[PDB]
Amino acid sequence: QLEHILNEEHIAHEPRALQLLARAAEGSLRDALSLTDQAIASGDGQVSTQAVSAMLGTLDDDQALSLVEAMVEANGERVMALINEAAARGIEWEALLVEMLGLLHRIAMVQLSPAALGNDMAAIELRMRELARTIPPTDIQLYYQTLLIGRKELPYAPDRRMGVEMTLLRALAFHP
Amino acid sequence: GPHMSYQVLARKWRPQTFADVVGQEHVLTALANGLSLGRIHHAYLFSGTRGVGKTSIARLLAKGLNCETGITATPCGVCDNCREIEQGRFVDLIEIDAASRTKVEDTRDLLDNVQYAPARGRFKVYLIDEVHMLSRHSFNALLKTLEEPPEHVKFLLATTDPQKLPVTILSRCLQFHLKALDVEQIRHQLEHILNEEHIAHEPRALQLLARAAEGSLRDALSLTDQAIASGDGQVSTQAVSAMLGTLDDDQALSLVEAMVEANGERVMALINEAAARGIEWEALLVEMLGLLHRIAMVQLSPAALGNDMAAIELRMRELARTIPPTDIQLYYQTLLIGRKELPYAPDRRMGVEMTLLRALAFHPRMPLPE
Amino acid sequence: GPHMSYQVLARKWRPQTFADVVGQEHVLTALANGLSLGRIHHAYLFSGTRGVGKTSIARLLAKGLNCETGITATPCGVCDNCREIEQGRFVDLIEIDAASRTKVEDTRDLLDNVQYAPARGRFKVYLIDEVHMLSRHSFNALLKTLEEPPEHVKFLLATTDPQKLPVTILSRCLQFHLKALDVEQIRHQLEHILNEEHIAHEPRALQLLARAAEGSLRDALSLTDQAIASGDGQVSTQAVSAMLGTLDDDQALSLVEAMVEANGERVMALINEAAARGIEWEALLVEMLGLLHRIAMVQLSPAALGNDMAAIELRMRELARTIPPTDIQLYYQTLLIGRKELPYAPDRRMGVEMTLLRALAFHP
Amino acid sequence: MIRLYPEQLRAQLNEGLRAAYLLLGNDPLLLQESQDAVRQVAAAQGFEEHHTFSIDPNTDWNAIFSLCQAMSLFASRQTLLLLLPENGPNAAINEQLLTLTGLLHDDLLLIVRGNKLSKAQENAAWFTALANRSVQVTCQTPEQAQLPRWVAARAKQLNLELDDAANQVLCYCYEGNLLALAQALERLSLLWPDGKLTLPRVEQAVNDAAHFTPFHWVDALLMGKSKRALHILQQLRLEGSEPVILLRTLQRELLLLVNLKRQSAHTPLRALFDKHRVWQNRRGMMGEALNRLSQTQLRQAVQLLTRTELTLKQDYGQSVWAELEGLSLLLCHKPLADVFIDG
Amino acid sequence: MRWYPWLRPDFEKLVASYQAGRGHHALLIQALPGMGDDALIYALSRYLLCQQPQGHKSCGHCRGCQLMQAGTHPDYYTLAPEKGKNTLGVDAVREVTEKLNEHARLGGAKVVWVTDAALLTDAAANALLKTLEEPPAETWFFLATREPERLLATLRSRCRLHYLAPPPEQYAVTWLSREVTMSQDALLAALRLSAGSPGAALALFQGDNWQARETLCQALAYSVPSGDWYSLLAALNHEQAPARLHWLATLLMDALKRHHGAAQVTNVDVPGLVAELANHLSPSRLQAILGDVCHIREQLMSVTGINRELLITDLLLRIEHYLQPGVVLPVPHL
Amino acid sequence: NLDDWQSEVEFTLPQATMKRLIEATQFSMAHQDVRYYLNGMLFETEGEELRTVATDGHRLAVCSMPIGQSLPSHSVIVPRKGVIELMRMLDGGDNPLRVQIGSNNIRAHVGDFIFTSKLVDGRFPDYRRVLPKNPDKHLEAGCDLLKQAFARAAILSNEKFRGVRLYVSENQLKITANNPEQEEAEEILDVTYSGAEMEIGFNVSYVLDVLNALKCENVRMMLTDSVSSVQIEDAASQSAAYVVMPMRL
RNA sequence: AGUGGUGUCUG
DNA sequence: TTTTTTTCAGACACCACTGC
Ligand SMILES: Nc1ncnc2c1ncn2[C@@H]1O[C@H](COP(=O)(O)OP(=O)(O)O)[C@@H](O)[C@H]1O
Ligand SMILES: Nc1ncnc2c1ncn2[C@@H]1O[C@H](COP(=O)(O)OP(=O)(O)O)[C@@H](O)[C@H]1O
Ligand code: BEF
Ligand code: BEF
Ligand SMILES: [Mg+2]
Ligand SMILES: [Mg+2]
Ligand SMILES: [Zn+2]
Ligand SMILES: [Zn+2]
Ligand SMILES: [Zn+2]
């Protein structure tokens, strides 16, 4: 529908930008249309893939899942980049740790039984599956314990940013 | 000294054009492009952290819409409409302190008067600030007029947490997220302001102010006003360091080294010196903890160090290369536990002293003699 | 002749003008320079621990701002405005107990009246105290008026827990951090108060009160009034040491020594003796922590033992020669955890006994 | 009175109409259809004028008494209806119900609609005075083991062909949701006038509406069905159920399980069941559960349940539903990790 | 409101402070439950609100004291938790503070008494600030607390603190023997269970809770040899759970004391059970069990609405798990 | 019951006198204000004069009436509820009114019955400093003439903050109102005046209440500058004065 | 508009 | 057979009945 709307609006569009917008819509067509008008705003009457992706990254709030993906993968530079993103957004750090804890707990519950994925998280199903199928339960246990300890010691840190960064550094250093 | 110059930098330096903003470029570029092409969406939401230009940019947009000339992305100043908007009390720019109009009867009263034509300008720009305070009924009441309002009414919403809004509204309105400001932008803004205020300033003072602002420029301006009040209308390293209650990184790194290199006598000497300067002990622990975390981050990647502490960069590198990560983790944990136990220590001074002594006794490469 | 009656040491001895304030020279000089230079902000947030001066500093700032002389760094008395402000009569100083007016109706109908001109003073000062107890919607209501108040309105917030305020509220203010008062200066203020009030005393009681006030002058005055009631108007060493639990003897060293040797019966016998003495368990534990701290000090650098305890000096030096630093650190951590969890025990004596049970049986 | 299921109501209505009809049960659909049938049959025998009332502490009883005693200028043959409140015939309502039971007449027909009545609590007086010449109609939601044949009967009476697969899919998405289930059958009839429903036809045009109570969750745990219990938990999360109700409902049966497994070393489970006054259908599933990985999950699960309870009852942010997922997975023969159990 | 003898000296030290006008308005009493803080505060209020006080006691003739005896006095404000709730809300504190703006109805002082400062909500405690700080003229405040450090720091900052010392152990035993006649070791153990407060020990003896303590002792006489600690649930689950958890923890403490050869234990009248506790249970296990029992008691006391049955069941099952070999024990932490 | 044997001041005052005295000051009290001393009416006794003062920090109202009986100077603050219910029970002007004010409670013997209330502990501010001390501009108008013009202007007034700009020129007065809808109302009135052009923006409800309190035919307003207060009274007496402090909008 | 009740949702 | 929930504090939202 976005493709048809843009084609009838004589708006130059790139095929990948439409898929990015649709994925970012979360199933609501009006969300896609508002994001599309905004993407035309971020630019000059053309829906370019780079501009749309940059706009989506600016609007992105899915930091904890990406942090868990990069920390489990042991990607230190990506983890630090994601922490920089979460800092620039003015995102609460204890909330970030709680979101990561919940994601790891849900990954473990999915590993125990596939029915643990409800309809509340239909946006992030695939990634969760990818993380549950490919990561042994021992590593998830270790990471959950590390992040729980870090959130326990978060208030007594130079600042919340450094506390979260150090907890993620410990989790990376585990390399289990 | 000067006259009644009470007008504080926080408000006197509120941006008045899109050229006077410190770089919310993802927002400014979109607003300029849309206003140039005319794709003026009927409702959208500036969402960010504190003091990063949500309200200011909203006012600049109102200026851009209501200028006497054609609808332009660069508002003028000779125009009567923009002059009224800048001075406040504009006929059509209806600022709505949403935290004072949370109720649904207030929202209904707002929606009844929507269809009335604008008086002097071309838009009746509703500027709802701190939207997240509206009740659920107020949000649902706004829903229909947010779908399609009259051709002259624009909604400018602004809030700190966009996730407390019902997601229907997040569908109705465009979303622009204003991120926090890097240290360089804040320090350059402080430089420019103090040039225009005829107040002599020093480099390290502005660097420390920009570091302690925490990514928001309103905190930086309040801190700058406090520093100007601390001095005789002058910004200096001594004044800002006394105001912020912190330590120069050289002293903290000297104490951290004396801990690492097992120079306990040096630890005692620097503790006594910091006692002489009248600096908080928990501040000492926090600064050593921050330096240890910076060493650990350097161990992760060389790009961890920021330019603000470039003076000690070399030493950082050395202490990062000398100490393997397990000892850095041990020191950080010991100092963290010491800070956590500091309130229950008999005295804060001896609490920090015993934290350092414990970090020295459990030293793996050079333990205290048994 | 008191207004009706003697109104307590803490209430009578509030700083009436500048240069009467004890310490806090950071905020004092900053406010003085702001008043003299014309750099006046609309929102000052005086945040700090208890009883170091946050309401008194704010009241002094309110006096200075709208004094009849002008915008003066040092307010006078005698004239109308600063006479009324200290008497709780001045209309333009609106004092809000934010812990009682937490509601949003109250904040909104406070903001309703901000636009009107002040009654007689230049500035319509709003002094909100205990700000952290305002509700979330109350803070968010105050946001846009702290940001852009009228030209005649000044806001003076005071907070004990500045972290509890929203980041936005902290962002719109000058966050003046009221540093706590160290032992020497709080002792000097107590000395000046007791000399001006013609109450005889002893110096040792003075520094006992100073070091037991935890860096808060209101607590020092409260303890001083308690000692005055106890000591029949004299702040004496014996009366303070009996009122404020202190360990004059070396029993804090004896119990530490018995606990170092992992001797159980002796430790329990000495705890029972201390309970018979009516000892203060918090004081006993802080003395143990300080004693282990000095043991660690003399372990690191010899001859660091304070000359004060030269009487028992050798004993601790002996310990410095005997017990490895790791065990001293472990004992310190255990006793400190006991200090932290002492209030949350079925009894104080039971909490101390549990702490010394955890601390007694590491090695055997 | 004549106690009746909805099956024979038509027949009874053809036999004759009594003084009062009491439609009781927890199923909105069964009550609604029974009321519609009763009103249609009454209209067939001249009962033309209708009325409605909600039995509430703020209702105007005087209007009810006036309309029951007095007659109208037209349509003298009249019927009256009352919606009983959620709790039922409150102690302040039984006396006025008795007055209505005195203020009736052969001209009026009374319809009583509401949830099931705790007969053990409320009996006689009003109940027996109606029982003299009245009908009780029990309209309660068929349970999971009974729903498939009900849906098959409904499909047969609506002229649809449901196979076992479509029947079980419909019984899956809609439980305790017989109203939406009937609406789903009606929508499927609208979608295809063929009347032949297969697996994909029902699969496409169906939503996971459902409606469960914590007892369903506890029963699913006792049977050890992972997917069923997790579906129930998700459904009560979306429905907005209070998690503390779930905690108490699980806790009762969990402490019973702990007691039974501890005492089973000296006594067979039959005498333990008799000791604790547990019913036979409960007895079967509890016997099935007691010998399914016990003596480890019964203290580990109590530990996790205590963790959830304290976390729920100290803060206000909740976030206990994932911990309830942990419990749902522990009691269904899927061992967890000590990391999440201890915390 | 009964007068205990040990209040008699301390009363003087307080009432003399209110005779010269030098009394701190906000007097915070630190006293164990039953020690007599309530009676002391009540007597002080009767002295203060009498229009013509005589010496150091209530005159018993003036309008103020006869209204106080009648339970109705407009100048006498009391802050107590609402019936059925163990919490003092912010609304009552706020109402009393607003009523303090008006002058005293009877022309005398204004006396506000908070029954127990520990039950105050955080909001209620904060609303009491700036009124303790600078109360209107002739306003006298009072507070009571089991442990002052549990109160808000700012709340006790503006309060002169008076500590009611429990009487000497021999004198407390003498008073208990004068009150009720039982074995000397029984009174001694009851006293030292109650933190030396004779009032709490006396209340323990008058109530049935001593029989419940004996029930727990019997259930332990079964539980310790066989490792069957779950049974104690029947003897633990009750409205008075914290008291029985405290008794269990004190039995464990006595066992640990006997392991180290301590001269004096708490349960002096129960030597056989503490001997069984010491012999069968390892000191490390004893310490872990004591720590967990105390932690569960504190959780049960602090968090409101908690389920006693879940807490006690988990505690007993965890203890039974700890008794088995090959398992780790809890480590106290910061 | 009556333990207030001694009273600070005593009045045997006609009912109509105190009816006017309260009615001329009641509307300026503060309702549930944080300044607890302003949530009431100050009765002040000096010479043979009794004065009621009420302010909320945005408007002051003072009304003085002679008694004839010499009384000591005294001040008292009667709360909002007490004074309102005393006003309600103050009917039947035939019977005199007895007033008995002590240091902590107030009593009013009306007709045959007795009324009791408590006092506000705070000390009322000095209203003499609120009154402008150098009124250089004096203007006169008709009470009803001025009031109807203000009402017509208030018709199209900001419903939230009812505020009008009053301009004074030579023998001419101007009242301008606007609402957020830009609906402008403008009323011009003929007055007698001698001074300089001046604009001042103040609330409308307060001025209308002031005019309604002065049931007179000639009204004198005294003004100093655009920022200070305005003192309104009648030209036939000086027993009732009102102070309206403007808005800075 | 003042007063009182119901009820729902946020920490 | 029934069997189902902690809490203190605060913010809205709707609907009598009163009172002009
Ligand atoms: N992008 C920016 N450029 C320049 N100044 C800024 C910027 N953002 C914030 N400020 C400073 O902060 C003050 C208030 O900013 P404001 O726009 O109110 O932030 P908010 O988004 O929180 O309302 C301004 O007066 C200005 O000095
Ligand atoms: N800086 C100070 N200088 C002098 N006295 C002080 C100071 N700080 C506190 N005090 C004493 O403490 C009493 C209470 O001070 P206050 O300013 O109310 O503390 P708070 O910040 O906690 O409200 C004062 O009456 C004064 O005696
Ligand atoms: F509007 Be901002 F958060 F100061
Ligand atoms: F106001 Be203070 F912190 F006692
Ligand atoms: Mg803003
Ligand atoms: Mg204060
Ligand atoms: Zn313009
Ligand atoms: Zn002065
Ligand atoms: Zn008396």
Short mmCIF file of C-alpha atoms in Angstrom, two decimals, chain A residues 36-120:
data_model
loop_
_atom_site.label_atom_id
_atom_site.label_comp_id
_atom_site.label_asym_id
_atom_site.label_seq_id
_atom_site.Cartn_x
_atom_site.Cartn_y
_atom_site.Cartn_z
CA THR A 36 6.41 8.10 5.12
CA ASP A 37 5.43 11.78 5.25
CA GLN A 38 8.21 12.35 7.78
CA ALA A 39 10.71 10.53 5.54
CA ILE A 40 9.73 12.83 2.67
CA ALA A 41 10.30 15.68 5.12
CA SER A 42 13.80 14.37 5.91
CA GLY A 43 14.92 15.06 2.37
CA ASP A 44 13.61 16.93 -0.68
CA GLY A 45 10.53 15.17 -2.05
CA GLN A 46 12.24 11.79 -2.31
CA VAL A 47 12.09 8.69 -0.10
CA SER A 48 15.73 7.57 -0.14
CA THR A 49 16.83 4.43 1.68
CA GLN A 50 19.71 6.14 3.49
CA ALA A 51 17.52 9.00 4.72
CA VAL A 52 14.76 6.62 5.84
CA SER A 53 17.23 4.38 7.67
CA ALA A 54 18.85 7.38 9.39
CA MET A 55 15.43 8.69 10.43
CA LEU A 56 14.45 5.26 11.78
CA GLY A 57 17.69 5.02 13.74
CA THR A 58 17.02 8.47 15.18
CA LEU A 59 13.53 7.30 16.18
CA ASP A 60 14.77 3.88 17.32
CA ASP A 61 14.25 2.89 20.95
CA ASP A 62 15.02 -0.85 20.68
CA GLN A 63 18.34 -0.54 22.47
CA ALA A 64 18.23 -3.41 24.99
CA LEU A 65 17.62 -6.15 22.41
CA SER A 66 20.47 -4.87 20.24
CA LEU A 67 22.68 -4.63 23.32
CA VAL A 68 21.97 -8.26 24.23
CA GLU A 69 22.58 -9.35 20.63
CA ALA A 70 25.94 -7.55 20.51
CA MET A 71 27.01 -8.58 24.03
CA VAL A 72 26.22 -12.26 23.46
CA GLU A 73 28.05 -12.04 20.13
CA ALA A 74 30.97 -10.43 22.03
CA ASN A 75 31.08 -7.29 19.87
CA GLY A 76 32.63 -4.66 22.12
CA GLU A 77 32.60 -1.78 19.64
CA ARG A 78 28.96 -2.42 18.74
CA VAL A 79 28.04 -2.64 22.44
CA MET A 80 29.75 0.68 23.15
CA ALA A 81 28.11 2.28 20.11
CA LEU A 82 24.70 1.11 21.31
CA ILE A 83 25.43 2.48 24.79
CA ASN A 84 26.36 5.80 23.16
CA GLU A 85 23.03 5.72 21.32
CA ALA A 86 21.14 4.98 24.54
CA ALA A 87 22.98 7.87 26.19
CA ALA A 88 22.25 10.39 23.43
CA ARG A 89 18.56 9.47 23.59
CA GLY A 90 18.41 10.37 27.27
CA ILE A 91 17.26 6.83 28.04
CA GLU A 92 17.15 5.76 31.68
CA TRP A 93 19.94 3.31 32.46
CA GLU A 94 18.24 1.24 35.16
CA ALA A 95 15.37 0.85 32.69
CA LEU A 96 17.89 -0.33 30.10
CA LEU A 97 19.24 -2.96 32.49
CA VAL A 98 15.71 -4.07 33.38
CA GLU A 99 14.82 -4.42 29.69
CA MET A 100 17.95 -6.51 29.07
CA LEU A 101 17.12 -8.68 32.09
CA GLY A 102 13.60 -9.25 30.80
CA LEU A 103 14.86 -10.11 27.33
CA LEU A 104 17.34 -12.67 28.68
CA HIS A 105 14.68 -14.20 30.95
CA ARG A 106 12.28 -14.49 28.01
CA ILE A 107 15.02 -16.05 25.86
CA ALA A 108 15.56 -18.70 28.52
CA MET A 109 11.83 -19.39 28.84
CA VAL A 110 11.60 -19.76 25.06
CA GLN A 111 14.51 -22.20 25.17
CA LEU A 112 12.54 -24.26 27.69
CA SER A 113 9.30 -24.17 25.66
CA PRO A 114 8.43 -22.44 22.36
CA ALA A 115 5.02 -21.40 23.73
CA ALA A 116 6.66 -18.78 25.98
CA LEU A 117 6.39 -16.18 23.17
CA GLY A 118 3.08 -14.38 23.61
CA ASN A 119 1.37 -11.94 21.29
CA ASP A 120 2.80 -8.95 23.18
#
